[PDB]
Design a binder for this molecule. Structure first.
Ligand code: NI
Ligand code: NI
Lengths: 296, 179
């Protein structure tokens, strides 16, 4: 397929400002904007002088987010507020994708990973949130989900895998935690009912090579008309879920299921931005960029 | 004095544009070749299988553009081998309209990329030879782009492969095989 016109992505250049959560909301679209334009290579029809004008904004959001880094290398909205399991895992997720953009201090990234594993992982692999984020609209379809330990564990695990190579040396309990998280997902994947959880956990399993057999059939047949993973309401959740599926399909090298999924995503005409658009904006452009990188 | 079957790819790797080409190519072959008493049958495949018209159902309805118009795409994976086995065992059965002592022709229209198929080509080809099934292959999209794709088209087609493998957009695909 053809890459998205960069002229429709101008509104994603957002100046980051706010608390430990407010800053990441504004940081997210900027980071994923240049990441997409890097792969698709549209800096010529958009102006290379603007690249540095956005690259330094990412640096700004990074340094401003460091002020909310707690002594346990965890992250919360406030320096006094109890650290969030999701927010910390989201900081790792965004920073891992921006390691080739700006200078990301490895001690910050690995410290957060070590905290998630040591203090926030149940012995059965489950990651638990003990201090939810204030802005509940920045967590996408994880908001008001019946399922559960599964959805959160899948989310955190995806972050750990995106930072596995860069923090394998410092944190040795990382491959063990990854396996444990994957064991819980695989053991309860067939019992999933919501398409969102099927999509996000399916991607987590696919990154391991543990999305096979009945788990795969469950994943593929959950797709409405073989082109999207749809839950009744909140379109933004369905875009986010389909993006996770696309990433899972690209991991499986399944180029029979990729084109109709990509085709559907492009016919939604979603370019991110707005209230509660953080996850969808981050997902729909991480997936489409991965598609551009992998498409023959 | 010839039975012609169509095995068309309906997997998601086939873009809707290339599927129209498939859907229009068949209409041309059926119209520019009647030319009775040639019989036609068509089955679309993906990860599932659907017979749109048998040799009997075509003998009752002569209009070519009518039998192919409501045909849609399956959008599954790509099970080429299983599709070939299903054609020779079912579509070429007398109970479906296959006539005795008539030429069996299979027209496989695929992009040359089988995927997710439990069956291999080495499990359906030696069976297609002992039944005497003429195999023509019509590559679509980027079926001639790669090396594994072009050798797959030659694998499906019989020998020699230089007389069986053609590109879909060719309007001279029928005038070259009649002689
Ligand atoms: Ni292309
Ligand atoms: Ni295909």
């Amino acid at each position: 397929a053809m890459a998205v016109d960069a002229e429709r992505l101008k509104h994603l250049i957002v100046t980051p400002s706010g608390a430990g959560e407010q800053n990441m909301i504004g940081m997210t679209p900027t980071v994923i904007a240049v990441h997409y334009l890097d792969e698709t290579e549209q800096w010529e029809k958009f102006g290379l002088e603007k690249r540095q004008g956005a690259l330094e904004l990412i640096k700004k959001g990074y340094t401003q987010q460091l002020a909310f880094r707690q002594p346990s290398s965890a992250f919360a909205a406030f320096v006094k507020r109890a650290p969030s399991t999701w927010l910390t895992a989201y900081v790792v997720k965004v920073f891992s994708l921006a390691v080739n953009l700006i200078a990301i201090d490895s001690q910050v990234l690995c410290g957060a990973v070590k905290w998630l594993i040591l203090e926030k992982q149940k012995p059965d692999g489950v990651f638990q949130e003990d201090a939810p984020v204030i802005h509940q609209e920045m967590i996408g379809g994880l908001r008001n989900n019946n399922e559960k330990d599964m959805a959160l564990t899948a989310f955190v695990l995806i972050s750990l895998q995106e930072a596995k190579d860069i923090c394998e040396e410092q944190v040795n309990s990382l491959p063990g935690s990854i396996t444990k998280a994957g064991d819980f997902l695989e053991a309860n994947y067939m019992n999933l009912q919501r398409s969102y959880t099927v999509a996000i956990a399916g991607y987590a399993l696919a990154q391991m090579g543990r999305l096979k057999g009945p788990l795969l059939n469950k994943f593929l047949t959950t797709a409405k008309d073989k082109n999207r993973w749809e839950d009744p309401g909140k379109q933004l959740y369905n875009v986010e879920a389909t993006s996770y599926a696309l990433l899972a399909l690209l991991q499986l090298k399944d180029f029979d299921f990729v084109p109709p999924v990509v085709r559907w995503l492009n016919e939604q005409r979603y370019y991110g931005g707005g209230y509660g658009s953080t996850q969808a904006t981050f997902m729909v452009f991480q997936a489409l960029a991965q598609y551009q990188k992998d498409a023959p | 004095d010839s039975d012609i079957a169509f095995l068309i790819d309906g997997s998601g790797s086939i873009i809707p544009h290339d599927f129209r080409r498939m859907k229009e190519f068949v209409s041309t072959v059926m119209e520019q070749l009647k030319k009775s008493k040639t019989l036609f049958s068509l089955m679309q495949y993906s990860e599932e299988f659907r017979i749109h018209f048998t040799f009997k159902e075509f003998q009752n309805n002569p209009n070519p553009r009518s039998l192919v118009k409501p045909i849609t795409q399956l959008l599954g994976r790509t099970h080429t081998a299983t599709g070939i086995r299903k054609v020779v065992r079912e579509l070429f059965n007398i109970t479906n309209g296959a006539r005795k002592n008539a030429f069996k022709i299979l027209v496989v229209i695929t992009d040359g990329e089988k995927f997710g198929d439990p069956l291999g080509y080495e499990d359906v080809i030696p069976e297609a030879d002992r039944e005497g099934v003429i195999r023509y292959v019509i590559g679509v999209g980027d079926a001639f782009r790669s090396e594994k794709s072009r050798q797959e088209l030659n694998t499906i087609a019989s020998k020699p492969p230089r007389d069986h493998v053609f590109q879909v957009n060719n309007f001279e695909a029928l005038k070259t095989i009649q002689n």
